[PDB]
Amino acid sequence: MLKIIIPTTMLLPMTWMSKHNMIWINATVHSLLISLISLSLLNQLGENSLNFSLTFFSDSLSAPLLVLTTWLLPLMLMASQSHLSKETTTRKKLYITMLILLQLFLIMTFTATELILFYILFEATLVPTLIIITRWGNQTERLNAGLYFLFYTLAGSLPLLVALVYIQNTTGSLNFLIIHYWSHPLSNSWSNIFMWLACIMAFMVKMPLYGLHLWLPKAHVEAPIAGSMVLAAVLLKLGGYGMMRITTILNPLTNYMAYPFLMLSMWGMIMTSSICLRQTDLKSLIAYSSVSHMALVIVAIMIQTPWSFMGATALMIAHGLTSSMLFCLANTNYERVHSRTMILARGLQTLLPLMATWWLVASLTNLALPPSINLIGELFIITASFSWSNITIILMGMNMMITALYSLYMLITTQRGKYTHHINNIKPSFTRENALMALHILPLLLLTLNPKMILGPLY
Amino acid sequence: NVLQIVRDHWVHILVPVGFVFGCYLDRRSDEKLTAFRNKSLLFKRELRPNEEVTWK
Amino acid sequence: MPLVYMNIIMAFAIALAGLLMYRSHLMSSLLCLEGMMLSLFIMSTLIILNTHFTLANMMPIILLVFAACEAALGLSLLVMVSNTYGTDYVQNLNLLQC
Amino acid sequence: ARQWQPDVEWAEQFGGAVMYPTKETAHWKPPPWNDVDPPK
Amino acid sequence: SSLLDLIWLETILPKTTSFIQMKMSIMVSNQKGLIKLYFLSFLITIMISMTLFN
Amino acid sequence: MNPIIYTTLIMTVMSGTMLVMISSHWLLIWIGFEMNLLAMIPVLMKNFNPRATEAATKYFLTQATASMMLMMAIIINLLYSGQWTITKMFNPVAMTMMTMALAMKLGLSPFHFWVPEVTQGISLQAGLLLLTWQKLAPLSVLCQISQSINPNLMLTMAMLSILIGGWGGLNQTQLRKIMAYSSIAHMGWMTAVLPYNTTMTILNLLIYITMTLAMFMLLIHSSATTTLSLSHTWNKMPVITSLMMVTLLSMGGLPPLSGFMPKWMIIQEMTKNESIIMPTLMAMTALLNLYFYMRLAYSSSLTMFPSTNNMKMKWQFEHTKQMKLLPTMIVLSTLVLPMTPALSSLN
Amino acid sequence: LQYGPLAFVLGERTTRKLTETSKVITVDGNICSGKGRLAREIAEKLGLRHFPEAGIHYADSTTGDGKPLDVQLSGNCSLEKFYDDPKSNDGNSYRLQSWLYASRLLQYADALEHLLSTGQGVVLERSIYSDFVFLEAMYRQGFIRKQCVEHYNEVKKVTACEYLPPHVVVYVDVPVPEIQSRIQKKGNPHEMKITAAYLQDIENAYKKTFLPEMSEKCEVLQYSAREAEDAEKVVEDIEYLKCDKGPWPDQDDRTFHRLRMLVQNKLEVLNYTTIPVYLPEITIGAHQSDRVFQKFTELPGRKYSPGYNEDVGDKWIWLK
Amino acid sequence: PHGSPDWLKVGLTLGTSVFLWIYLIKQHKEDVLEYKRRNGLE
Amino acid sequence: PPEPTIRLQEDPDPEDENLYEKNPDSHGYDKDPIVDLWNMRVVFFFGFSIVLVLGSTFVAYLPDYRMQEWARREAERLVKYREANGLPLMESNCFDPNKIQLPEDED
Ligand SMILES: CCCCCCCCCCCCCCCCC[C@@H](O)O[C@H](CO[C@H](O)CCCCCCCCCCCCCCC)COP(=O)(O)OCC[N+](C)(C)C
Ligand SMILES: CCCCCCCCCCCCCCCCC[C@@H](O)O[C@H](CO[C@H](O)CCCCCCCCCCCCCCC)COP(=O)(O)OCC[N+](C)(C)C
Ligand SMILES: CCCCCCCCCCCCCCCCC[C@@H](O)O[C@H](CO[C@H](O)CCCCCCCCCCCCCCC)COP(=O)(O)OCC[N+](C)(C)C
Ligand SMILES: CCCCCCCC/C=C\CCCCCCCC(=O)O[C@H](COC(=O)CCCCCCC/C=C/CCCCCCCC)COP(=O)(O)OCCN
Ligand SMILES: Nc1ncnc2c1ncn2[C@@H]1O[C@H](COP(=O)(O)OP(=O)(O)O)[C@@H](O)[C@H]1O
């Protein structure tokens, strides 16, 4: 695993020693090379795992997330190239350093053979993201947003640490292999109930769960484009990865401890999908759509069936890609309008046809159009929930309909209609933006050819 | 021009070299765990006449 | 434990309570501190003499010396406070607040 | 088109002796710039 | 949107915590600086500890 | 004052601390405490003004009362057991009085009131000395009698100290009061693990001393005693503000910084002894310390506050008196998490 | 080995260098008077060192090269704009006043450090003391607001509560019509816009406040225009008067050491000149301050410390 | 300000670094030799 | 009220700089035409040409480490064996009961 960690570390001295007008080229090229190297991890095996050493190991749940994390950085660099043009060389190097540190922390988090190291890196990811949100944020609310994005997370995970060490005082180890092989049931007791709560609430808050999601619209709206990319695409999947890793010791208590969370997620998907219908902001709409998709993933994880896990993994990957592309499109519109309001900019297919095509494809992918991996995860989770209970489909069905609605609404209000007359600063889309859109959308349609690469270890 | 591009393009080799370094490090890590090489109850094999270790 | 030790401890507790009261006049606070030290000296002397621990006879005098030094220190501080305010009331020490 | 940065009005929030002063503590004044008080 | 997400879900967890912490901070830091009160509290805690923990 | 006199007074303070730490006799420990208190007062009054005199007299009153209580505890212990060696105290009442005296010397709640006022009154170097070197002796004495303390009293005083520090740090604008409340909170954190493992106490003390040394050195480097004067710093030395922001993040316990090392370790140790609720409450309470650290970081470096016209002249002049060990202090206070198992050295 | 506590411990005692000749002297008067020539002649005759009056770009001469920097990078104010439109909307007048006061404070610190390090006396024009009269002239004429003068009073008291006033104050008294005639003869186009009320206010403030306040603690030389050209009489009167009322005879070696600490490390001298109170005349927002600081850092000899600038010509960098 | 590279300080620093490195290498060799002697490796 | 009504000295908000006005054929990467063109070239070559195509082909031809065809052949031979000799195909018990020691109750 060091063959990928070491180049990510070496990205920092290369950036800090580069010329004042050549940092972006070097960063993008070497990030793409690192992603190409990390593509090797996709060759998983039906056997146990790729146990590299005592500290790092790779599974078919960790491999797609690692590949997505490595692939995200070049896209974030291309997205941030624009609004950091008038920025001093030292501050641009600091921004690239923060991005590289975040990628390194995520890469070390996704392997994380030991659970305490996983938690330490899980919380280490919080610092560069907070710095990015609070420093390079345009609006005045960013600071408050950052505060939220911090405290919620910590409020979730401070008990977890205690629980973690408590386990090592009883079980004696926190290595995931030993934990899996020496698993023992949790008796129905109040102490076990609170241990379950401490283990679960840590990852519930960052997913986020409905009722604990108030930090997410603030963090995504107030953050710069790269921050929105990293939060929507990868940083949301940390909770799901942690839950799928840690639910191996919570049985059979979960069989009755998942009812409040299942109810909360199955109603919050509807609530957030309806919230998306009436939104005056594009970024808030995308954030609430992300909340709905993550609530569906939470339902899948709480069901705890093989089809649930497969659908959860596929949906996480597809949602990360789709949300990243949607945030990029919204930022491209904002950089010309400088308002971030849906109804101010209208009739854009007359002026930017290729951007309208990109918007259509992104909306269709969000709308879960077959045979995309989005719908693969959707159908897997839906069938698993139907097996769990034949009534859930009703709620699920409603969500699907509502989803499509707001998606096309986002497509119709911004692209269709008559253009705004008093906006004459709509320049033709650059090659950079179109290349970013293509690099976002082509991997989705290529992954739909080989779904088993993102279906997880239970395929 | 020699001795001038090196002053400007020495950073380009920084990422690739580290990569191979990591590979070397991976091999070093592998040696420590050879405590069960050819001792597995599933892959227990008699060595070839010109073979010393099953894997490296 | 005899009643004399109880009386000495009661005197020390009374002096401590008087020091902690702070009606006014920091000079009275230093007086209460000196009374506490006197109670300590008397109790230590009685304990050391009763048990015939000869080498411990050094302890009381040393104690007094050190404590008296602190007494002088306190007086100096008090004087300076007065030279700032013209008086030694406790309530004049309210510039630094929590 | 410009990143928002704190202005005078925002900065005056921290100019007080204590954050969010109460009605009782409103009349309180921050300490002198140098830690020297007038001999009055 | 308004009643649940923007009002009550905001009031329960974050705003209540902020209000409670602000009130506790105000109560703790509202000291006039009088050592009279400080040492009266010292006397009270010295008195309470001996009775409670012995 | 004269440099010779200042050096002699500093040597006297350090020698009193050393006498406290190396003595096996209770009278010698009391003598060391008396020497430390006697030589500390002029240090607090190096820059004469009403504020320094007020802080010095408050400090003298508090320390004299604590020393008298300590002497009475020694006397009662001698009465109920004719022993002068620092060992099992053999008497619950003497133990309680010794604990209260040592907590008043340390500044633990509810004896915390003097710390913010004395720190605000004195200068930055005096505050550095008071918050770093004045904790070595009482903590050493407490560690020597760790098996004797009542766990209930120590734990409740530690929890009260953490709560008061976290709550009081929210209302402060002056930086010295912020550092005083942070010191109170860290004292509460340290004193909560004495009954279980003194090695954790010493490790936390070392980490806290490094972090607070770095922070006071940074505050000395840029002459700021309030929030706005600190916010003015970005226009001259942005590197100082960035380093101070990183240090503030470290003090809050955010991994992978050094400040996460003690708490984590302490929590783990306190989980060995079947104690679960208390570490959880300490974590949620230290969230408040993290909050006001975050507010200071927002006001310091993560944003750019308005400046003044005269600052341009400050651009033309360099910081002449350059302090040493500051880069080392920052490095130890930020990037020593991977060297955690080294705490096995019984530091 | 720079002067420090170790130097004071071993050999550096600055009370020995004083030979009754130091006698810091300030020669001050009204605008465009003969005080400059008098100060120069006093310095020449008494063997002291003459410090020219502090201007806008005085601090630029003391750091790096002596060449002044741009007005935007140093001062952000001009005297010519003040003369042309004293009631400017952008608050140029008080920005000028504060920059001049801070420059005078730096000049006084430089003169004091030279005197304490060499023992040779110095001669100065208007110091931090007697600068305030211009402030008064700006207030009575209505050029600046009351919050402005409160700011100036705060900064002045905080900065000057720690410096020793000069031994001798020399005042060159010139009538307002005569000084107006000299201003007319000078021919500087901006200075002919000065009104008679401004000079009358400045003169009244100088006589009413400066003369009695310095009288009870120092020695005062109120000299007229005709009797000022004879510098021999001035120097003779300087020698004749004896200083026994000021704090200078009360002074001791330890407080000399503290003062010599203060006068060096100019960042501590100017520390309180940027107190965080926000008047629109002096406060500058984040964006403008960032832009100006970045522009200043791009100067050839300002990016690093004075000895660590490759473009200037500093060599052997990697061993310094 | 105008100050030449202090050759005395540079020489002291370089000598200290070289001496520390040599002492560290010698200490490591002595330690490994003593370890092998005590445990009877070579 | 002679106040300037200006709270502080501030730069005016600059207008956004159009990349096309000073550089047709911009590609929108930088304001330096040569650096911008080479940035476009390297981005396209490493994203579309290098990673997107070669990585996709590498993933397509990954060796079967999941043991799918191996499982196919194993199941085929097992079904052949069980059909040939009349065995009841799939066995309901994963482990042989002779090797399982159930706890006697006698209740
Ligand atoms: C706000 C955004 C979402 C955040 C997360 C929300 C979800 C948190 C809920 C956690 C799970 C449920 C809590 C307790 C579950 C215990 C099972 C209980 O529900 O069943 C009954 C239990 O009845 C009562 O619940 C008993 C406890 C009553 C007191 C608890 C308070 C209930 C309301 C508190 C609401 C406050 C929510 C906010 C907290 C900060 C059956 O009684 P019994 O079979 O005999 O005993 C079962 C337990 N045994 C087997 C170990 C013995
Ligand atoms: C910020 C991280 C901490 C940094 C600490 C400062 C580092 C510089 C200190 C320089 C050396 C320190 C000591 C000097 C060495 C000789 C003295 C030695 O002989 O004393 C020993 C004392 O041992 C020393 O304490 C060990 C020194 C090692 C300190 C560092 C441990 C930090 C580990 C976690 C942080 C990672 C550090 C990374 C590098 C700084 C004898 O111990 P002993 O008298 O018989 O027992 C007394 C202790 N009891 C009472 C608890 C039993
Ligand atoms: C634009 C207008 C049209 C122009 C184009 C005309 C041509 C049309 C062709 C386009 C689609 C038509 C369908 C034709 C598909 C043929 C190829 C396909 O069948 O191959 C697939 C193979 O595709 C790849 O497996 C999927 C692509 C790899 C995905 C990796 C993405 C690249 C990295 C980017 C970063 C990753 C981000 C996300 C993290 C996971 C399935 O292979 P499989 O049937 O099984 O067996 C292959 C042979 N074996 C047996 C030897 C193994
Ligand atoms: C975004 C906000 C989320 C905040 C976190 C929500 C989850 C909080 C869950 C509790 C946190 C601490 C749990 C303890 C960690 C597990 C350790 C454990 O299970 O050990 C138990 C200890 O159990 C406890 O101590 C639990 C006591 C809880 C103390 C803290 C209370 C916090 C608030 C409780 C109500 C909140 C529950 C619902 C929260 C919903 C989300 C906000 C057994 O102890 P022993 O003595 O060894 O065994 C007994 C037999 N010999
Ligand atoms: N505090 C001040 N405010 C306004 N103008 C000042 C101030 N100090 C000096 N000046 C200007 O500096 C110029 C020269 O100084 P001055 O002493 O009056 O004449 P001279 O150059 O002959 O010594 C004059 O035009 C004077 O107005």
From Swiss-Prot, chain C:
Its main location: mitochondrion. One of its GO terms (cellular component) is mitochondrial inner membrane. It is found in: Mitochondrion inner membrane. Keywords: Electron transport, Membrane, Mitochondrion, Mitochondrion inner membrane, NAD, Respiratory chain, Translocase, Transmembrane, Transmembrane helix, Transport, Ubiquinone. Gene3D superfamilies: 1.10.287.3510. Pfam families: Oxidored_q2. It catalyses: a ubiquinone + NADH + 5 H(+)(in) = a ubiquinol + NAD(+) + 4 H(+)(out). The keyword Cell membrane does not apply. The chain crosses the membrane at residues 1-21, 29-49, 61-81. GO terms for biological process: ATP synthesis coupled electron transport. InterPro entries: NADH_UbQ_OxRdtase_chain4L/K, NUOK/Mnh_C1-like. It comes from the Eukaryota. Disulfide bonds: none annotated. Its EC number is 7.1.1.2. PANTHER family: NADH-UBIQUINONE OXIDOREDUCTASE CHAIN 4L (PTHR11434:SF0), NADH-UBIQUINONE OXIDOREDUCTASE SUBUNIT ND4L (PTHR11434). Core subunit of the mitochondrial membrane respiratory chain NADH dehydrogenase (Complex I) which catalyzes electron transfer from NADH through the respiratory chain, using ubiquinone as an electron acceptor. Part of the enzyme membrane arm which is embedded in the lipid bilayer and involved in proton translocation. Core subunit of respiratory chain NADH dehydrogenase (Complex I) which is composed of 45 different subunits. Belongs to the complex I subunit 4L family. This is NADH-ubiquinone oxidoreductase chain 4L.
From Swiss-Prot, chain F:
It catalyses: a ubiquinone + NADH + 5 H(+)(in) = a ubiquinol + NAD(+) + 4 H(+)(out). Its EC number is 7.1.1.2. The keyword Nucleotide-binding does not apply. It is a multi-pass membrane protein. Its main location: mitochondrion. InterPro entries: Complex_I_Subunit_2 (IPR050175), NADH_DH_su2_C (IPR010933), NADH_UbQ_OxRdtase_chain2 (IPR003917), ND/Mrp_TM (IPR001750). This is NADH-ubiquinone oxidoreductase chain 2. It comes from Sus scrofa (Pig).
